[PDB]
Design a protein around this ligand. Structure first.
Ligand code: CAC
Ligand code: CAC
Lengths: 119, 119
């Protein structure tokens, strides 16, 4: 018989200018300015990424299975899944926040952080 | 300032045995049996993929921006997005089926085909 593999291709969610980028990594919290040494990190499980940019409100992204890759000319965020503050279900985020499964609570907290609801 | 890139990594949606795989490509409709010459195709815009397998109901996937890659030992389906018959919103599929935007109608039709609702 056949082996079938159904694969979702890599895809860019958003790309834009930033003055500051803040998130929480396994080695701790980090803030990346335009002049920054190259870096590779793994975001914490309930990580939120705050993107500050000239002329716009902060962009906040709940991030699931996130990795960071600060090269010389880019801050690259590789995500298993993410949703932007615009997309989040504020009700469902608090529902998943209640630790049903621990992996469910991280995605709930990450989302509450992107709503500015939790620290 | 910084260039930020937010990237969703490639991810395997499903992988399993199959006896038959049916879908509609730009060069026409194709059915791939265990013994098959290698092939590369682009699925049509409102494509649905039918996976037949021993001991189970057919698996149907609405596919968006799909490509097919039949190698010697795998049928690999690369998708921009997809949803399985289980996940689809049957009501919203008919709502998007009404050609609001032509790209919206393809995703609506692809989904109706995975419900077995349209041919
Ligand atoms: C490594 As496989 C056969 O689960 O795509
Ligand atoms: C090629 As680009 C700067 O839009 O990731």
């Amino acid at each position: 018989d056949l082996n079938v593999e159904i694969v979702a291709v890599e895809r860019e969610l958003w790309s834009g200018p930033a003055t500051f980028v803040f998130t929480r990594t396994t080695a701790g919290e980090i803030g990346i300015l335009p002049r920054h040494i190259p870096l590779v990190a793994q975001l914490v499980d309930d990580a939120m990424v705050r993107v500050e940019r000239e002329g716009e409100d902060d962009l906040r992204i709940a991030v699931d299975g996130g990795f960071l890759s600060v090269t010389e000319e880019t801050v690259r965020i590789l995500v298993e899944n993410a949703q932007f503050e615009s997309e989040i279900d504020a009700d469902a985020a608090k529902e998943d926040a209640a630790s049903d499964d621990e992996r469910t609570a991280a995605w709930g907290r990450a989302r509450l952080r992107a709503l500015g609801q939790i620290d």
